[PDB]
């Protein structure tokens, strides 16, 4: 059945390919996940609020400018 | 020996073996060519073992 | 494969004498 | 790194040296004595003629067995030879000294080989197999070369056909540069 | 090649460059330059552009960051680089393989953004997105083009500064993330006031909560409105953003580590990681640009052959003008199926329509990834050549079998990375998270990079 | 020869593994004096005798 | 091709922010 | 008129007279190359593989007495070489050598 | 979760053997990771699990 095996077989291989890859990946551990949690969190606070600060200080200037 | 190797491979990985060939390498290590039963896909089993 | 191809390529290669330094790496440009 | 002589006016000089060069010491001593005192362009042209056998290096001290040639009569001598390896080793050293002059901003076309010196380097040990089950030394005789080039008042430009050559690119040089870069 | 590499020649000889650092710069010196560099960019992100009054509208420029010296943003530089590597990767553009030709090549890729800087600006001026050039004239256009030129010009050197060891990582990545992080915190602590028929109230979700919790007698109503604004940020949209953040962090670290070693030295064991998001965010980005213009293109098409069932069946279009501004929505057909839901209930109303979109959105990014690799120059063969160029090799393998071992994962990590890229992006779009699934990945990735450098320096800092 | 004993083939293998250059990190040890493996062997220059 | 030190960038970049500051300030107050 | 082509007869017999058997055909190739510099004044002489085949057609010692050759001075296409021109030497089979002058050939 | 010999003293023989088997399985999985590109963290774990196994066997003996 060309019409069936033509595009079904690549998709069935595709599903079995992802599992073969996924069971090969070095998935981060819970301990590593926790490490990336704090690191990202502290970083996001660092970038989020300092970039936040520049915007608030520019407000009083911007209201005067316009 | 080939009997022990067959019993080891089956028990460790819960697979079936068709035959075991063995050579002792020039560096002194023994290499086992373990052929699995036809219903066992060696590429699949290798993924389980982490070989690939 | 036709055996006269051996002669044809040999003579073609013998024509590189006039084009030294710009010999085309592959004549079969397609692909 | 101490040279045997101090330049007379250091700001007007350029240095160059090499160590453990695998070029015969006796041949290179004679070759250096030929170009000593020459203007850099004249010296460069002369060692390119030694390569092509159009000018001989007189062998004056280390001359045991050396043959006679018609070109040796230029130097008031009967014995001469055409050491190609010594000529080429000394050209590479001249090129390096020439570059060092350029880096210091000297007038390269006014340079003269004021000082040049060939020293024996530690010999390298091979062997050769003699009759009656004997073994004998097979010594290479390398040398240290050091030169000093100085500005003088005679100016000689580079030949026209010489500066017209392409700056040859080195594929193998690129390959190593990729690895580091 | 001949009429492109040499055309750059005259101009790159005059354009400036940043100097090599003599020695390896101190980290606490790196931090100083970075913080300075980031601060300046941030300042550019707020300063209003000079002389823009007609249209983008002025009141929004008071609110906004649209209209700032970053108005054209880092986009020209990113688009400049992608277009180069896109053509270069495909072999369409030939890159001089020497470092000096590479140093010029850098200037060429720099040159594009400077070209793109003027090109993108011209589009916005003539169309009235700042205002008619007749209203502004040459002088006002002169300054606006110059300012839009200098900001990207500054942005370029500042990134090149960090790229060359005067700081940490690269500016562009730092810059795009800082925007992402700021948007998230702003939308939680924004003191903006919204003038409603219910009164005046604050915008920032955290700020709005305590402002409402005291301002409303119905404290359950605060529990409802505060977390379920349908035109304003909600604590949910914060919670939706936070939840995605963790999952991306989990799948950020996915990678298949292949063993490799130097073919020139014993031991020295290392590894080449095939990252699951092998294609970065490019696949979905290209997919989104396709979908958006397919909506625009159909709009103009369907107004000329609407009576033909095929053009209608292709995709219908209407004009929603009830109250708010006339916004163009699809009415049916393929484009209708290629659209995401705008409300949760809408997914329930039509079960088929939702699955049709998702298969398109998972298939498109996955298919984009698979096709992107070959063109982008990241396929196994290209990867193997890079490893061969670096004199690396898989132990026990010949140089050819490397390609066989790389194709085990790279072609699949391509598609599944794209499918994973889309799927998480559906959650970002569906659950109202801020910045789309593209944005969070960008943010998490960048912060991860600086973190792992940061810890290494902390080893002796 | 091809015809080998187990004892001989095993003794040969140990000679095979000893015949390698030193790790380069050994140079960076605190009191280290070794510059190279001075016990290298070549199958032609010097023979094992067994 | 000029090779640039970070200070030049900071000095150039710093004064550019200074310039637009006057232009925004001057544009209004002197036209007020 | 740098690019030019002429047809010559070379008296190989008198060029290799008195040479040893195992060097007779190697030396003819040398005397043909030396002839080329003299006629065209070009260090870069390139001897065609047919002319080499013709010179060796009778072994190493019974080399042909006369050989008709064509010299064509051409522009050296590579600018890396120091030589602007080179000479190409091709074989010209002739049923006879009697009365053959040195001829100008015009393409 | 380190195998300290003080935590094994009272345990029963079948319990300790089970604990031993987990360590023997954990090691063979690491020995695979040694040749298939295991992280430097996993290479350093081998000695930790070789000695853990020896600790269990000592207490059993
Ligand atoms: Mg004597
Ligand atoms: Mg004698
Ligand atoms: Mg003997
Ligand atoms: Mg022997």
Curated annotation (Swiss-Prot), chain B:
Per the record, the domain of life is Eukaryota
Reported modifications of this chain:
N-terminus is methylated by METTL11A/NTM1.
Indicate where this protein resides in the cell.
Cytoplasm; Nucleus
Record note on domains: The N-terminal beta-like import receptor binding (BIB) domain mediates interaction with IPO5, IPO7, KPNB1 and TNPO1.
Q: What does this protein do?
A: Component of the large ribosomal subunit. The ribosome is a large ribonucleoprotein complex responsible for the synthesis of proteins in the cell. Binds a specific region on the 26S rRNA. May promote p53/TP53 degradation possibly through the stimulation of MDM2-mediated TP53 polyubiquitination.
Family membership, please give it: Belongs to the universal ribosomal protein uL23 family.
> What do we know about how this protein assembles, alone or with others?
Component of the large ribosomal subunit. Interacts with LYAR and GNL2. Interacts with MDM2; this interaction may promote MDM2-mediated p53/TP53 polyubiquitination. Directly interacts (via BIB domain) with IPO5, IPO7, KPNB1 and TNPO1; these interactions are involved in RPL23A nuclear import for the assembly of ribosomal subunits. Interacts with IPO8.
Q: What is this protein called?
A: Large ribosomal subunit protein uL23
Gene encoding the protein: RPL23A
Swiss-Prot record, chain D:
Segments of skewed composition (Basic residues): 166-181
What SUPFAM superfamilies does the database record attribute to this sequence? Answer: Ribosomal protein L22 (SSF54843)
Q: Which Pfam families does the entry mention?
A: Ribosomal_L22
Please give the superkingdom of this protein's source: Eukaryota
A Gene Ontology molecular-function term? Answer: structural constituent of ribosome
| Classification via InterPro entries | Ribosomal_uL22, Ribosomal_uL22_CS, Ribosomal_uL22_euk/arc, Ribosomal_uL22_sf
Primary localization: cytoplasm
Location comes to: Cytoplasm
Tell me which Gene Ontology terms the entry assigns under biological process.
cytoplasmic translation
Instruction: Cite the entry's keywords alphabetically.
Output: Cytoplasm, Ribonucleoprotein, Ribosomal protein
Q: Which family does it belong to?
A: Belongs to the universal ribosomal protein uL22 family.
What job does this protein perform? Component of the large ribosomal subunit. The ribosome is a large ribonucleoprotein complex responsible for the synthesis of proteins in the cell.
> What does the subunit section of this Swiss-Prot or TrEMBL entry state?
Component of the large ribosomal subunit.
What is the name attached to this protein's record?
Large ribosomal subunit protein uL22
Traced from the root, the source organism's taxonomic lineage reads: Eukaryota, Metazoa, Chordata, Craniata, Vertebrata
Swiss-Prot record, chain H:
Q: Name one GO molecular function term.
A: structural constituent of ribosome
Tell me the residues on which Phosphoserine occurs. 81
GO biological process annotation, one example: cytoplasmic translation
CC terms in the record's Gene Ontology section: cytosolic large ribosomal subunit
Q: Write down which residues bear the modification named N6-acetyllysine.
A: 58
The residue stretches assigned to a coiled coil in this entry are none
| Chain positions with N6-succinyllysine modification | 38, 53, 58
Any idea where this protein resides?
Cytoplasm
Q: What is its main location?
A: cytoplasm
Q: What does this protein do?
A: Component of the large ribosomal subunit. The ribosome is a large ribonucleoprotein complex responsible for the synthesis of proteins in the cell.
Its subunit composition reads:
Component of the large ribosomal subunit.
Spell out the family assignment given in the record's similarity comment. Answer: Belongs to the eukaryotic ribosomal protein eL31 family.
Q: By what name is this protein known?
A: Large ribosomal subunit protein eL31
Q: Source species, please?
A: Oryctolagus cuniculus (Rabbit)
Show the taxonomic lineage.
Eukaryota, Metazoa, Chordata, Craniata, Vertebrata
UniProtKB/Swiss-Prot annotation, chain I:
Q: Where in the cell is it found?
A: Cytoplasm
UniProt modified residues of type Phosphoserine: 28
Domain of life, per lineage: Eukaryota
The cross-link Glycyl lysine isopeptide (Lys-Gly) (interchain with G-Cter in SUMO2) sits at 24
Task: State the family named in the UniProt similarity comment for this chain.
Answer: Belongs to the universal ribosomal protein uL29 family.
Sum up the protein's function in the record's words: Component of the large ribosomal subunit. The ribosome is a large ribonucleoprotein complex responsible for the synthesis of proteins in the cell.
Name-wise, this protein is Large ribosomal subunit protein uL29
The species this protein was found in = Oryctolagus cuniculus
Gene name per UniProt = RPL35
